[PDB]
Write a protein that binds this ligand. Structure first.
Ligand SMILES: [Mg+2]
Ligand SMILES: [Mg+2]
Ligand SMILES: [Mg+2]
Ligand SMILES: [Mg+2]
Ligand SMILES: [Mg+2]
Ligand SMILES: [Mg+2]
Ligand SMILES: [Mg+2]
Ligand SMILES: [Mg+2]
Ligand SMILES: [Mg+2]
Ligand SMILES: [Mg+2]
Ligand SMILES: [Mg+2]
Ligand SMILES: [Mg+2]
Ligand SMILES: [Mg+2]
Ligand SMILES: [Mg+2]
Ligand SMILES: [Mg+2]
Ligand SMILES: [Mg+2]
Ligand SMILES: [Mg+2]
Ligand SMILES: [Mg+2]
Ligand SMILES: [Mg+2]
Ligand SMILES: [Mg+2]
Ligand SMILES: [Mg+2]
Ligand SMILES: [Mg+2]
Ligand SMILES: [Mg+2]
Ligand SMILES: [Mg+2]
Ligand SMILES: [Mg+2]
Ligand SMILES: [Mg+2]
Ligand SMILES: [Mg+2]
Ligand SMILES: [Mg+2]
Ligand SMILES: [Mg+2]
Ligand SMILES: [Mg+2]
Ligand SMILES: [Mg+2]
Ligand SMILES: [Mg+2]
Ligand SMILES: [Mg+2]
Ligand SMILES: [Mg+2]
Ligand SMILES: [Mg+2]
Ligand SMILES: [Mg+2]
Ligand SMILES: [Mg+2]
Ligand SMILES: [Mg+2]
Ligand SMILES: [Mg+2]
Ligand SMILES: [Mg+2]
Ligand SMILES: [Mg+2]
Ligand SMILES: [Mg+2]
Ligand SMILES: [Mg+2]
Ligand SMILES: [Mg+2]
Ligand SMILES: [Mg+2]
Ligand SMILES: [Mg+2]
Ligand SMILES: [Mg+2]
Ligand SMILES: [Mg+2]
Ligand SMILES: [Mg+2]
Ligand SMILES: [Mg+2]
Ligand SMILES: [Mg+2]
Ligand SMILES: [Mg+2]
Ligand SMILES: [Mg+2]
Ligand SMILES: [Mg+2]
Ligand SMILES: [Mg+2]
Ligand SMILES: [Mg+2]
Ligand SMILES: [Mg+2]
Ligand SMILES: [Mg+2]
Ligand SMILES: [Mg+2]
Ligand SMILES: [Mg+2]
Ligand SMILES: [Mg+2]
Ligand SMILES: [Mg+2]
Ligand SMILES: [Mg+2]
Ligand SMILES: [Mg+2]
Ligand SMILES: [Mg+2]
Ligand SMILES: [Mg+2]
Ligand SMILES: [Mg+2]
Ligand SMILES: [Mg+2]
Ligand SMILES: [Mg+2]
Ligand SMILES: [Mg+2]
Ligand SMILES: [Mg+2]
Ligand SMILES: [Mg+2]
Ligand SMILES: [Mg+2]
Ligand SMILES: [Mg+2]
Ligand SMILES: [Mg+2]
Ligand SMILES: [Mg+2]
Ligand SMILES: [Mg+2]
Ligand SMILES: [Mg+2]
Ligand SMILES: [Mg+2]
Ligand SMILES: [Mg+2]
Ligand SMILES: [Mg+2]
Ligand SMILES: [Mg+2]
Lengths: 118, 214, 122, 54, 113
RNA sequence: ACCUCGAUGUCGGCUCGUCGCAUCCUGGGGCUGGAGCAGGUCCCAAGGGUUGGGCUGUUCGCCCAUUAAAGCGGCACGCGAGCUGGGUUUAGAACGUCGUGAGACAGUUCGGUCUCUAUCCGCCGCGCGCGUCAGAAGCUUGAGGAAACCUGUCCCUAGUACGAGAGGACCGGGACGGACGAACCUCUGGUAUACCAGUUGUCCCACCAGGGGCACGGCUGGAUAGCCACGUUCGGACAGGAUAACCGCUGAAAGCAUCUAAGCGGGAAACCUCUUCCAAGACCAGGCUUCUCACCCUCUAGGAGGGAUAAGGCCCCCCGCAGACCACGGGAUUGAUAGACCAGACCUGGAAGCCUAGUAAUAGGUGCAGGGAACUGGCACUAACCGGCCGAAAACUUAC
RNA sequence: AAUUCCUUGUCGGGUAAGUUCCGACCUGCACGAAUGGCGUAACGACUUCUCAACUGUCUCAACCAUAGACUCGGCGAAAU
RNA sequence: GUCAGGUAGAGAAUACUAAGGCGUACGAGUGAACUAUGGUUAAGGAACUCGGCAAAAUGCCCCCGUAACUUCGGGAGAAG
């Protein structure tokens, strides 16, 4: 995907790599999370790449998703109940909805979740 | 007398010469242009022709603009600009609603291009005006790249209005002069410019007959 | 691309091996030297029985440059080592036989003896 | 550098008066039988049921 | 869609043979010398190729007496009498940028079989 | 010794310029002890430019190699709230000299803290409010400002004119160069932190196989787009008008004579236009069309206050090669702005697994393979909407 | 010369050029023998000069990821 | 002042880890200059500068072989 244009979100490449992997894992584990809105914007490409890999189940995709997100539990649930459940849907896997601004620092939070209409 | 036409830059490439050389060429899409107005000296104070270009849906155009286009007798266009004439002999050949395409130019004649330069952002003095940086060593004290002295002291005690220093560049009209046209077409209005012209991909450029040599 | 203090090869049999550039010629604030530019260079070392001794101030023309130089057909030149040819006031070499290839630009720069005598022109 | 004289009432207050805030518009949406108020950013989210309002 | 395709086709040149970076090729160069036309032979190794539609462009590099030499022509050049690739070469890099700093026995090019 | 000792920081170097002309070249003229080139001198002329190095802290100066030249000066001996402390200009020590002595020496030699977050003026850029007389959208003319303004070599005329010879013309063409500025990413390169691969050590996922985590991206080879120059194009006019110096015509005062006092003129990088950008906040606030051109209430009928509207605008959304925030630009279902899918190009270079041969570290096949951002199109699968807010004529005088 | 104002003394080596350096001459303003003289193997975060490699110190800067600078939210300074 | 694990290791250096304790009390975003900490860079390699200041570069183990000079230890890990 297109890289973040400005100075990066978390403050370094390794840090955002770990951050994005953790966000993707937690979001796929749970289903609906509330996070910083630009963070969800930058989250969208990673989760969508995971959905793309999931659509075609195979050993190479097993290893690709493993090397990306580092959890046997989340990769298994991803390949078992998320994967085939988006077989007939092309693109548009996540929804971004923003909510009341944070009290701590007035940062705009957005609730990002999988599409469960179908 | 003086010809002109609007265009759009989409790419920039090279083409081969009949003298067996190679020449870089700028893609300019001089799409079809329609005359929307005529300017007469007795009624307005000068002589010019106004042109409109592009395709916009009738609801995306502002209602006064759509009404003006309907009064002109042509369908709505995207952007509007004019070309200024110098005598009524060239005025008489242009009439309201006339359509102009790219074959009006003949290859072998210089052209002048005018467009908006790229948006470079708020840039430092040395990058903007081509200053010289000082030593990044030998004991510099955090003035590595910042210009420095500006003028005298207590006489005149000021800056000399017009001093060249920091500010935003680009995002302004810039003209390039005396350019080859390498090859023109009649089918879909595509005109070629040997060299590099200022602007952007999918941007707006206007080409006019060269004033320098023509 | 030859500048002041530039360190060059010799492609001649005059008796010199290594020359140091002195100035680049051609005009005020002359800044770079390209293939077919007459420059002035000084000899750092030489063959013991050579015609020219070290320390002489001799005019030279550069023929082999590492940096790309375009031609009319877009032809870019990357050579392997910066080399020059020792020249005299009569636009003629001081040597009699030449090492390595040469570029076409010398032909347009009127230097005929070098381009004719070189083993192959490229 | 430092200031050397006290900047006057008019200067201080005139500079300060430009710093303010702007009140936005509100959007009424019919969800769950109640009409509640969101910014237009949340109209679709409110109709579908994807935004949390205390 | 590279809308310049129907303008490129006007000057597009036929009988273009296939070549890849790292292939050994020679080019004939038409040179006018004193109002006289003649033909030269320049052998070399292609190091990069960048297409442009009608503007497919490539470089040719050779080695002479241990020092490299180059000529750079685009594909549809009317100066090129013939593009006679000698043997198709196999190179790991499609751009041979690193070939600048390999000397002598280092700067050889693999031959596909 | 008139201002400054309840503080005006000092020489040089770097960056950054500005102004005058007593002008270095380029430009135009007068004279010669100016055969021709090659000169010397004086006038007019500030448009443009005016080297890099070795030496020393240097200014200066000497030397080395070109170009057209390597100008003179003023601007707190331009410029430290822009930078350097090399010397002058503290505290050590030493040499030589002076002084029996502490110490000193416009004598020398070594190292020796350079602080300040911009209030105003000024400046470089970008914004909010208001008026241009009903209210809005476009296009603009343009007074008035800015930018730029440099130049070398070769061939023909013609080795003719000339000159004893050697030597060698004016003017004009044609072609080819440089330094400077403007623009751009086709080439060619630089960079490339979600792209690929190779590799050392360590830790982890039940075993291995394979993977990842960290060690400046752990170290390197690359590299799409974007940004950029070393890369590629273009420009420095032609011509027109009035002029400096200069050269003239017919001509008198003064029968002549005289470029001038009447008049008519030629005459340069100077001057005004011509080239490019800004520009109606240009307050004489300019001009041409297009669009909604009538619903009220209240105070008291003099005007004023409040509400309900259209065109249009704003908010908000996705965003952009537009951007510090703003501003600018695109689109909103009657939809391709952003995201993804597919395809293609491109980068990367032979994935995983299985089998075969080899005891082994491997190699081969399945296969132009696997993986992959910014490049192009098709599809609404997702996000930008059952919508709110700003926003319409006091009139009078003359002629027709 | 850690002593030399004229002085960048003159002569030789190094580079294109060397007011520094090295080697000699003595015209030692104003060296000099225990406030020691001349050399000296070894050492020195000592002084000065040259050389090969190395490099953005430079020609001439470009790009990239950081921490500020920027906007928003919270608290909230000073020299004058 | 006292306890001193594993793998590489000459090691109490250094890199990653166990036992064990922390992310140390302002944050969320926007490719601006510019400042600071770093990486890379065509090609030339000290041409800037008072000075190669800073940077860049070699760097470990085992072998082969190492000059002028000297107080006979050294110089010497010379250099390669
Ligand atoms: Mg520029
Ligand atoms: Mg600089
Ligand atoms: Mg610094
Ligand atoms: Mg006094
Ligand atoms: Mg006083
Ligand atoms: Mg004081
Ligand atoms: Mg001062
Ligand atoms: Mg001072
Ligand atoms: Mg004068
Ligand atoms: Mg003259
Ligand atoms: Mg004279
Ligand atoms: Mg002058
Ligand atoms: Mg000028
Ligand atoms: Mg110097
Ligand atoms: Mg001055
Ligand atoms: Mg001063
Ligand atoms: Mg000054
Ligand atoms: Mg001064
Ligand atoms: Mg300051
Ligand atoms: Mg100040
Ligand atoms: Mg002192
Ligand atoms: Mg001092
Ligand atoms: Mg003392
Ligand atoms: Mg004594
Ligand atoms: Mg005494
Ligand atoms: Mg005493
Ligand atoms: Mg000291
Ligand atoms: Mg101080
Ligand atoms: Mg301070
Ligand atoms: Mg302030
Ligand atoms: Mg004007
Ligand atoms: Mg590169
Ligand atoms: Mg790059
Ligand atoms: Mg990375
Ligand atoms: Mg593991
Ligand atoms: Mg690790
Ligand atoms: Mg690190
Ligand atoms: Mg690498
Ligand atoms: Mg770029
Ligand atoms: Mg008379
Ligand atoms: Mg007369
Ligand atoms: Mg107005
Ligand atoms: Mg509206
Ligand atoms: Mg907008
Ligand atoms: Mg490639
Ligand atoms: Mg594998
Ligand atoms: Mg892609
Ligand atoms: Mg696209
Ligand atoms: Mg209202
Ligand atoms: Mg009134
Ligand atoms: Mg001495
Ligand atoms: Mg002395
Ligand atoms: Mg002595
Ligand atoms: Mg001396
Ligand atoms: Mg020195
Ligand atoms: Mg003496
Ligand atoms: Mg004495
Ligand atoms: Mg004694
Ligand atoms: Mg004594
Ligand atoms: Mg002693
Ligand atoms: Mg001694
Ligand atoms: Mg000694
Ligand atoms: Mg470098
Ligand atoms: Mg520079
Ligand atoms: Mg990056
Ligand atoms: Mg921060
Ligand atoms: Mg900051
Ligand atoms: Mg900031
Ligand atoms: Mg505060
Ligand atoms: Mg220990
Ligand atoms: Mg650790
Ligand atoms: Mg612990
Ligand atoms: Mg900064
Ligand atoms: Mg830095
Ligand atoms: Mg590198
Ligand atoms: Mg270099
Ligand atoms: Mg050196
Ligand atoms: Mg010096
Ligand atoms: Mg150091
Ligand atoms: Mg030794
Ligand atoms: Mg030894
Ligand atoms: Mg050693």
């Amino acid at each position: 995907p297109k890289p973040t244009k400005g100075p990066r979100l978390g403050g370094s490449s390794s840090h955002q790599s770990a951050l994005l992997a953790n966000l993707a894992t937690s979001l796929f584990e749970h289903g609906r999370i509330k996070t910083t809105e630009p963070k969800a914007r930058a989250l969208r490409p990673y989760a969508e790449k995971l959905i793309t890999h999931a659509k075609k189940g195979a050993l190479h995709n097993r290893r690709e998703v493993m090397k990306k997100i580092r959890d046997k539990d989340v990769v298994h649930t991803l390949f078992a109940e998320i994967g085939p459940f988006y077989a007939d849907r092309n693109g548009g896997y996540t929804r971004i909805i923003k909510v009341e601004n944070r009290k701590g620092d007035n940062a705009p939070m957005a609730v990002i979740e999988l599409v469960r209409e179908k | 007398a003086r010809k002109g036409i609007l265009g759009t830059k989409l790419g920039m490439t090279q083409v081969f010469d009949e003298n067996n050389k190679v020449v870089p060429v700028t893609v300019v899409k001089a799409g079809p242009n329609v005359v929307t107005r005529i300017r007469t000296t007795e009624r307005d104070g000068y002589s010019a022709v106004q042109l409109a270009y592009g395709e916009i849906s009738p609801r995306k155009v502002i209602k006064p603009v759509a009404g003006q286009f309907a009064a002109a007798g042509v369908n709505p266009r995207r952007h509007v600009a004019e070309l200024r004439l110098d005598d009524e002999a060239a005025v008489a050949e242009y009439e309201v609603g006339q359509e102009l395409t790219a074959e009006i130019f003949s290859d072998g004649a210089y052209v002048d291009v005018t467009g908006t330069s790229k948006g470079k952002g708020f840039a430092g003095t040395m990058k903007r005006h081509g200053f010289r940086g000082q030593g990044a060593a030998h004991g510099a004290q955090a003035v590595h790249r910042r210009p420095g002295s500006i003028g005298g002291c207590a006489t005149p005690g000021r800056v000399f209005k017009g001093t060249r220093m920091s500010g935003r560049m680009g995002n302004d009209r810039v003209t390039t002069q005396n350019l080859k046209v390498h090859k023109v077409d009649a089918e879909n209005g595509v005109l070629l410019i040997k060299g590099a012209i200022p602007g952007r991909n999918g941007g707006l450029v206007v080409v006019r007959s060269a004033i320098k040599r023509g | 691309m030859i500048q002041q203090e530039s360190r060059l090869k010799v492609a001649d049999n005059t008796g010199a091996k290594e020359i140091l550039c002195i100035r680049v010629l051609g005009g005020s604030s002359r800044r770079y030297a390209g293939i077919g530019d007459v420059i002035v260079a000084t000899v750092k070392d030489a063959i013991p029985g050579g015609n020219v001794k070290r320390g002489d101030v001799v005019k030279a023309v550069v023929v082999r440059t590492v940096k790309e130089r375009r031609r009319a057909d877009g032809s870019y030149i990357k050579f392997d080592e910066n080399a020059a040819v020792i020249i005299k006031n009569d636009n003629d070499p001081r040597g009699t036989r030449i090492f390595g290839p040469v570029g076409r630009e010398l032909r347009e720069k009127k230097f005929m003896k070098i381009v004719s005598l070189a083993p192959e022109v490229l | 550098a430092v200031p050397k004289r006290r900047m006057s009432r008019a200067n201080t207050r005139s500079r300060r008066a430009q710093w303010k805030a702007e009140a936005p518009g509100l959007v009424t949406v019919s969800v769950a039988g109640q009409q509640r108020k969101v910014p237009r950013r949340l109209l679709k989210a409110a109709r579908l049921g994807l935004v949390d309002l205390d | 869609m590279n809308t310049l395709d129907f303008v490129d086709q006007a000057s597009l040149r036929d009988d273009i043979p296939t070549f890849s970076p790292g292939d050994t090729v020679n080019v004939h160069v038409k040179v006018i010398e004193g109002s006289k036309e003649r033909i030269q032979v320049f052998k070399g190794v292609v190091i990069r190729r960048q297409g442009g539609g009608i503007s497919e462009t490539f470089t040719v590099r050779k080695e002479s007496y241990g020092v490299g030499v180059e000529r750079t022509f685009p594909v549809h050049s009317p100066n090129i009498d013939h593009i006679d690739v000698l043997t198709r070469g196999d190179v790991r890099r499609a751009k041979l940028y690193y070939l600048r700093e390999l000397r002598g026995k280092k700067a050889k090019i693999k031959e596909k079989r």
